[PDB]
Design a protein around this ligand. Structure first.
Ligand SMILES: Nc1nc2ccc3cc(O)ccc3c2nc1Cc1ccccc1
Ligand code: NA
Length: 192
């Protein structure tokens, strides 16, 4: 009655290969295993150092990356291979889509909040192309300057050509969770 079907396509190779691409990126030494320890050191503490984020921003960012990948079933001290990684993404995505439909806070959005906070010079919550290019290179999500520019042509921008968190979070829902065709090309040619 009150039920609505959630947009998912977890059996599609295009969604599987998206997270396989990122898993290999996390799998620095290419041994097929990753840990939450490495994610939080690389994907958080080391990004915030290069971005010169404040200590509190560094802490808040760590809390959000920590919580996000715990929603994937990862815990400190546990090695994780891709099959488990992808099964956790199925659970994470399904959970996140329900929270979103119910207007409950989502891990993807809070992660986005922590990132935008680092680039919130004036408090209006804007990310400029130049800021994104720096993030994309430091986080490794988008080192190519061309890809970063494609991301901004792809996204809806404000009057200054800038980007806000709601937009990027809605893109992320389509790109990482549901495989919405509207999110295709979010990172240009950097991520399939
Ligand atoms: N910066 C990222 N870092 C990673 C790192 C590993 C990932 C592994 C996945 O399987 C899927 C996505 C990612 C990932 N996605 C982003 C995008 C993002 C940008 C801004 C705020 C929040 C997220
Ligand atoms: Na590894």
């Amino acid at each position: 009655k009150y039920a609505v079907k959630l947009k998912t396509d977890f059996d599609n190779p295009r969604w599987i290969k998206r997270h396989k691409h990122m898993f290999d990126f996390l799998d620095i030494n290419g041994n097929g295993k990753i840990t939450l320890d490495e994610i939080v050191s690389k994907a958080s503490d080391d990004i915030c150092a290069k971005l010169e984020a404040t200590p509190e921003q560094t802490k808040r960012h760590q809390v959000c990356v920590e919580a996000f990948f715990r929603g994937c079933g990862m815990e400190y001290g546990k090695e994780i291979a891709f099959p488990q990684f992808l099964d956790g993404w199925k659970q994470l995505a399904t959970s996140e889509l329900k929270k979103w439909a119910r207007n409950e806070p989502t891990l993807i959005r809070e992660w986005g909040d922590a990132v935008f906070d680092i680039f919130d010079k004036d408090g209006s919550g804007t990310i400029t192309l130049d800021e994104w290019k720096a993030y994309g290179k430091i986080s490794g999500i988008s080192p190519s300057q061309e890809d970063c520019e494609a991301t901004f042509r792809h996204c809806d921008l404000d009057n200054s050509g800038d980007l806000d968190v709601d937009e990027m979070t809605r893109q992320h829902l389509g790109f990482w969770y549901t495989l919405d065709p509207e999110a295709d090309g979010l990172y240009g040619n950097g991520v399939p």
